[PDB]
Enzyme design. Sequence first.
Site, PDB file in Angstrom:
ATOM      1  N   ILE A  10       0.823  -1.213   0.000  1.00  0.00           N
ATOM      2  CA  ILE A  10       0.000   0.000   0.000  1.00  0.00           C
ATOM      3  C   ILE A  10       0.858   1.264   0.000  1.00  0.00           C
ATOM      4  CG2 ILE A  10      -1.684   1.347   1.243  1.00  0.00           C
ATOM      5  CD1 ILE A  10      -3.002  -1.030   2.211  1.00  0.00           C
ATOM      6  N   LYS A  33       1.263  -3.137   8.918  1.00  0.00           N
ATOM      7  CA  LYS A  33       2.386  -2.211   8.948  1.00  0.00           C
ATOM      8  C   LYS A  33       3.570  -2.836   9.628  1.00  0.00           C
ATOM      9  CE  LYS A  33       3.898   2.322  10.679  1.00  0.00           C
ATOM     10  NZ  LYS A  33       4.595   2.632   9.372  1.00  0.00           N
ATOM     11  N   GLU A  73      -7.479  -1.774  10.745  1.00  0.00           N
ATOM     12  CA  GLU A  73      -8.635  -1.926   9.835  1.00  0.00           C
ATOM     13  C   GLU A  73      -8.200  -1.263   8.521  1.00  0.00           C
ATOM     14  OE1 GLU A  73     -12.025   0.927  10.109  1.00  0.00           O
ATOM     15  OE2 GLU A  73     -10.862   1.942  11.576  1.00  0.00           O
ATOM     16  N   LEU A  75      -8.750   0.837   5.062  1.00  0.00           N
ATOM     17  CA  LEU A  75      -9.619   1.749   4.292  1.00  0.00           C
ATOM     18  C   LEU A  75      -9.054   1.939   2.906  1.00  0.00           C
ATOM     19  CD1 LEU A  75      -9.704   2.570   7.449  1.00  0.00           C
ATOM     20  CD2 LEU A  75     -11.217   4.414   6.720  1.00  0.00           C
ATOM     21  N   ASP A 119       1.877  14.194  13.955  1.00  0.00           N
ATOM     22  CA  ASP A 119       2.289  14.166  12.558  1.00  0.00           C
ATOM     23  C   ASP A 119       1.144  14.088  11.609  1.00  0.00           C
ATOM     24  OD1 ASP A 119       4.093  14.372  10.439  1.00  0.00           O
ATOM     25  OD2 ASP A 119       4.418  12.222  10.308  1.00  0.00           O
ATOM     26  N   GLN A 123      -1.868  12.375   3.973  1.00  0.00           N
ATOM     27  CA  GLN A 123      -1.486  10.978   3.722  1.00  0.00           C
ATOM     28  C   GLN A 123      -1.975  10.025   4.820  1.00  0.00           C
ATOM     29  OE1 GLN A 123       0.765  13.752   3.371  1.00  0.00           O
ATOM     30  NE2 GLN A 123       0.370  13.529   1.171  1.00  0.00           N
ATOM     31  N   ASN A 124      -2.030  10.483   6.054  1.00  0.00           N
ATOM     32  CA  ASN A 124      -2.518   9.626   7.140  1.00  0.00           C
ATOM     33  C   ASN A 124      -3.950   9.902   7.584  1.00  0.00           C
ATOM     34  OD1 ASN A 124      -1.908  11.822   8.825  1.00  0.00           O
ATOM     35  ND2 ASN A 124       0.138  11.026   9.232  1.00  0.00           N
ATOM     36  N   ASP A 137      -2.159   6.170  12.163  1.00  0.00           N
ATOM     37  CA  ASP A 137      -0.820   6.300  12.783  1.00  0.00           C
ATOM     38  C   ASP A 137      -0.784   7.185  14.001  1.00  0.00           C
ATOM     39  OD1 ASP A 137       0.216   4.640  10.890  1.00  0.00           O
ATOM     40  OD2 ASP A 137       0.668   6.347   9.548  1.00  0.00           O
TER      41      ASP A 137
HETATM   42  O1  LIG Z   1      -3.281   2.610   3.946  1.00  0.00           O
HETATM   43  C1  LIG Z   1      -4.434   2.294   4.204  1.00  0.00           C
HETATM   44  N1  LIG Z   1      -5.425   2.354   3.287  1.00  0.00           N
HETATM   45  C2  LIG Z   1      -5.246   2.814   1.952  1.00  0.00           C
HETATM   46  C3  LIG Z   1      -5.474   1.950   0.871  1.00  0.00           C
HETATM   47  C4  LIG Z   1      -5.279   2.387  -0.421  1.00  0.00           C
HETATM   48  C5  LIG Z   1      -4.865   3.689  -0.636  1.00  0.00           C
HETATM   49  F1  LIG Z   1      -4.687   4.113  -1.899  1.00  0.00           F
HETATM   50  C6  LIG Z   1      -4.627   4.565   0.410  1.00  0.00           C
HETATM   51  C7  LIG Z   1      -4.810   4.127   1.708  1.00  0.00           C
HETATM   52  C8  LIG Z   1      -4.810   1.905   5.574  1.00  0.00           C
HETATM   53  N2  LIG Z   1      -5.902   1.248   5.869  1.00  0.00           N
HETATM   54  N3  LIG Z   1      -5.882   1.115   7.219  1.00  0.00           N
HETATM   55  C9  LIG Z   1      -4.815   1.663   7.760  1.00  0.00           C
HETATM   56  C10 LIG Z   1      -4.093   2.196   6.739  1.00  0.00           C
HETATM   57  N4  LIG Z   1      -2.908   2.909   6.757  1.00  0.00           N
HETATM   58  C11 LIG Z   1      -2.242   3.292   7.857  1.00  0.00           C
HETATM   59  O2  LIG Z   1      -2.626   2.985   8.996  1.00  0.00           O
HETATM   60  C12 LIG Z   1      -0.964   4.061   7.620  1.00  0.00           C
HETATM   61  C13 LIG Z   1       0.288   3.510   7.927  1.00  0.00           C
HETATM   62  F2  LIG Z   1       0.327   2.283   8.485  1.00  0.00           F
HETATM   63  C14 LIG Z   1       1.480   4.197   7.672  1.00  0.00           C
HETATM   64  C15 LIG Z   1       1.437   5.462   7.088  1.00  0.00           C
HETATM   65  C16 LIG Z   1       0.209   6.039   6.769  1.00  0.00           C
HETATM   66  C17 LIG Z   1      -0.969   5.339   7.022  1.00  0.00           C
HETATM   67  F3  LIG Z   1      -2.145   5.891   6.689  1.00  0.00           F
END
Ligand SMILES: O=C(Nc1ccc(F)cc1)c1n[nH]cc1NC(=O)c1c(F)cccc1F
Length: 281
Positions: A10, A33, A73, A75, A119, A123-124, A137
């Site tokens: 991802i 992660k 979870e 998304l 932070d 993006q997050n 995060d």
């Molecule tokens: O990245 C995620 N979803 C996602 C899927 C496709 C995308 F284009 C886009 C998003 C995601 N789902 N659940 C948690 C996620 N991400 C994070 O928790 C995360 C991370 F572990 C490290 C850095 C940024 C994050 F958002």
Amino acid sequence: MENFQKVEKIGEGTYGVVYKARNKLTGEVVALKKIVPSTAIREISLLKELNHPNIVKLLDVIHTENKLYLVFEFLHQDLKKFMDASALTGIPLPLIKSYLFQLLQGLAFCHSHRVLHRDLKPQNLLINTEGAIKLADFGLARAFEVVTLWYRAPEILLGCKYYSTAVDIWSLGCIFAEMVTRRALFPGDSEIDQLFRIFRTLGTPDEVVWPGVTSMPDYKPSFPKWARQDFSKVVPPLDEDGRSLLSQMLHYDPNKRISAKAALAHPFFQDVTKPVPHLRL
Ligand SMILES: O=C(Nc1ccc(F)cc1)c1n[nH]cc1NC(=O)c1c(F)cccc1F
């Protein structure tokens, strides 16, 4: 890792690689992660507790073979991709307002438990097909490829070591202005460039607006003195309510800066709704 099948990468998180994965047993699709001191263990365990509809749920913490994996979870999109995707026409204001309100809810919850993000950035911030947006995060920062400074609060940039929950309000204000204008508020490419962009727009801070500023670790009497710009020039065409709220989220003095909880009561949210975004997965 055995209990998971990495379906795809991802992205490259701050603390390691991010995978979309399926739980070989539960069948659930999830975000995996890859990130070990006991402190980091104790911090992340706290995180398992702060559950909120606007916080990406930490499903599991796997400390196996002296490696660290967080299971979240899943998304389908983050706010950065959605912004780029909505550059043409912009995000509708009703949707901008709903995102802002839910994010403030997430923050008010974390902050009430003394947990800051530290932070925030588009993006997050993860969104779904149902009009929900969630903080990802959260708390990972305390617990532990250029990192963006664009959303960094100025007390951080000035060397303040013991900063507050106000830093997250500042970041969320920057993200708010970015949704509205379709342009980053303060796109710094170094810590000084970041600081000086802030100064140029909001005015060089002094002891009048920010008592104690000139005594901060990285403050220099030699900083140029820029005049504050007017917000009507900064975030058109946000209405007076929005601008008022933004200005309070961008107060220099962290102690003057509005809280998440107070921001929820602002008249800007008087007419908040929960629109559904059109997103293509
Ligand atoms: O990245 C995620 N979803 C996602 C899927 C496709 C995308 F284009 C886009 C998003 C995601 N789902 N659940 C948690 C996620 N991400 C994070 O928790 C995360 C991370 F572990 C490290 C850095 C940024 C994050 F958002």
